[PDB]
């Protein structure tokens, strides 16, 4: 004779902003679950992000192209923010090719099946010359957490092509997490609480899958606890 | 001297524990620890410091 | 060395079999130098002539 919380309505206000509700929470477990989920979400949500980039006419991050106004380094900085959803493969090669005057946005990426470009309006560059043309190949991987270039440099593994441009990998889609435990008047009970998780992401991980995976991870660690050897 | 060859290296230094950071008012400090986002304090709205 | 499909096949096989030493024979030394240059500047493959 106990209760247990069931996942209820998940309102989506915007593509990035989401509210998830959990109705039948026992007194006291509101904050426990709120915080556990906040921690797991902020720390461990797997996402995909660009790991390295190859642009044609550029030797290193610090050089500059004709007919663009951003520096190449700023192009990498723009790519770091690219929110992308990869479904099947672990490493995909996206291709960006644009010519002529105009802003090179994220929408211009060559449309592949398995990859979803969440924010096509995201700017990359501005051309400023009729005959100026930019071509690049952006390599996107799946991962968890935060891995900088400089740590992976120990494991270079034939980084030999000087055209290669390494980018720091922020393998995490979630930007912000807040939760509120508030009185959940259930028709036959006095003091019950509902947990409301409000989350802001770059628009790659869907709310339901994020929450499910986080609960999965926490449940797995609890599983680790259930058995105790004492041997 | 016959000839000279100069080579410029460029290095991206990220902030790490032990570096010195300061404000404009004379407050100083050494960055002591990099905390995960979740550990950092956050206001009701959820924005972390 | 940019459109010849043999070069792409060579790179693909090498980059897919990085843990194998491969003996690659070509006709003339000039083509060998061009091959070293292209494997280096487009796949970073270490190759002695």
Q: What is the DSSP letter of B48?
A: B
| A46-171 placed in CATH 3.40.50.2000 | no
Residue A114 near residue A89 (C-beta atoms within 8 A): yes
Residue C47 near residue C36 (C-beta atoms within 8 A): yes
Structure tokens at A107: 């929408």
Place of tokens 């902003």: A17
Across the interface, do C40 and A161 touch by the CB < 8 Å criterion?
Answer: yes
Residue A138 near residue A88 (C-beta atoms within 8 A): no
Min Cα separation C18/chain A (Å)? 9
Across the interface, do A158 and C44 touch by the CB < 8 Å criterion?
Answer: yes
Which of A167, A96, A100 shows the shortest CA–CA distance to A130? Answer: A100
List the resolution, Å.
Answer: 3.3
Burial status of residue C18 (CB atoms within 10 A of its CB: 0-12, 13-18, 19 or more): exposed
Residue A166 near residue A62 (C-beta atoms within 8 A): no
Which of A90, A64, A93 shows the shortest CA–CA distance to A76? Answer: A64
Across the interface, do B38 and A149 touch by the CB < 8 Å criterion?
Answer: no
Is some CB atom of chain B closer than 8 A to the CB atom of A21? no
A163 contact residues in C (CB cutoff 8 A): 41-42
Which of A196, A190, A187, A214 shows the shortest CA–CA distance to A27? Answer: A190
Q: What's the first-to-final CA gap in chain C, in angstroms?
A: 17
Across the interface, do A161 and C46 touch by the CB < 8 Å criterion?
Answer: no
> What does the alpha-carbon distance between residue A49 and residue B43 come to, in Å, rounded to a whole number?
28
Phi, psi angles (nearest 5°) of residue A74: -70, -30
> What does the alpha-carbon distance between residue A205 and residue A177 come to, in Å, rounded to a whole number?
14
What does DSSP say about strands A7-12 and A145-147: parallel, antiparallel, or unpaired?
A: unpaired
> What does the alpha-carbon distance between residue A181 and residue A191 come to, in Å, rounded to a whole number?
12
Q: Which of A57, A160, A162, A164 to mutate to test the interface with C (most CBs of C within 10 A)?
A: A160
Q: Chain B: residue nearest A172 by CA?
A: B37
Q: Which residues contact A175 (CB under 8 A, 6 or more apart)?
A: A16, A200, A201, A202
Q: Which residues contact A221 (CB under 8 A, 6 or more apart)?
A: none
Q: What's the first-to-final CA gap in chain B, in angstroms?
A: 57
Structure tokens at A165: 């441009």
Residue A18 near residue A199 (C-beta atoms within 8 A): yes
Place of tokens 């400090």: B29
Q: Is the dihedral of CA A224, A225, A226, A227 positive or negative?
A: positive
> Which residue of A157, A158, A161 is in closest CB contact with C41?
A161
Is some CB atom of chain C closer than 8 A to the CB atom of A143? no
Query: How many C-beta neighbours within 10 Å does residue A158 have?
Result: 13
Residue A158 near residue C46 (C-beta atoms within 8 A): yes
Q: Which of A47, A178, A199, A214 to mutate to test the interface with B (most CBs of B within 10 A)?
A: A178
Is some CB atom of chain A closer than 8 A to the CB atom of C42? yes
> Which residue of A38, A62, A178 is in closest CB contact with B45?
A178
Is some CB atom of chain A closer than 8 A to the CB atom of B46? yes
For A21-67, the DSSP string reads EEEEEPTTHHHHHHHHHHHHHHHH--EEEEEEEEETT-SSTT---TT
Tell me how the structure was determined. cryo-EM
Across the interface, do A162 and C46 touch by the CB < 8 Å criterion?
Answer: no
């Amino acid at each position: 004779e106990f209760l247990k919380p069931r996942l209820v309505d998940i309102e989506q206000v915007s593509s990035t902003h989401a509210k998830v509700t959990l109705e039948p929470l026992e007194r006291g477990f509101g904050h426990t679950l709120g915080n556990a989920l906040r921690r797991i979400l902020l720390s461990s949500m797997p996402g995909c992000a660009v790991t390295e980039v190859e642009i044609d006419g550029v030797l290193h991050e610090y050089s500059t192209k004709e007919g663009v106004q951003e520096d190449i380094l700023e192009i990498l900085l723009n790519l770091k923010g690219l929110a992308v959803r990869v479904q099947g493969k672990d490493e995909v090669i996206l291709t960006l090719n644009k010519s002529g005057i105009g802003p090179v946005t994220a929408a211009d990426i060559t449309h592949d099946g398995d990859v979803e470009i969440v924010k096509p309006q995201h700017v990359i560059c501005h051309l400023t010359d009729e005959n100026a043309s930019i071509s690049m190949r952006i390599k996107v991987q799946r991962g968890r957490g935060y891995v900088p270039a400089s740590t992976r440099i120990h494991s270079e593994e034939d980084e030999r092509p000087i055209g290669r441009l390494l980018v720091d990998a922020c393998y995490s889609p979630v930007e912000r997490i807040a939760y509120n435990v508030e009185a959940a008047r259930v028709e036959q009970r006095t003091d019950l609480d509902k947990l409301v998780i409000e989350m802001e992401t770059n628009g790659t991980i869907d709310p339901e899958e994020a929450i499910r995976r986080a609960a999965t991870i926490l449940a797995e660690q609890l599983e680790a606890f259930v058995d105790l050897r004492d041997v | 001297v016959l000839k000279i060859v100069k080579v410029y290296l460029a290095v991206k230094r990220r902030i790490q524990p032990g570096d010195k950071m300061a404000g404009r008012h004379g407050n100083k400090g050494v960055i002591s620890k990099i905390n995960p986002i979740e550990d950092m304090p956050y206001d009701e709205n959820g924005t972390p410091v | 060395w940019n459109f010849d499909p043999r070069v792409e096949w060579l790179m693909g096989y090498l980059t897919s079999h990085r843990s194998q030493k491969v003996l690659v024979i070509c006709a003339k030394a000039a083509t060998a130098l061009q091959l070293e240059q292209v494997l280096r500047e487009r796949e970073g493959i270490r190759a002695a002539v």
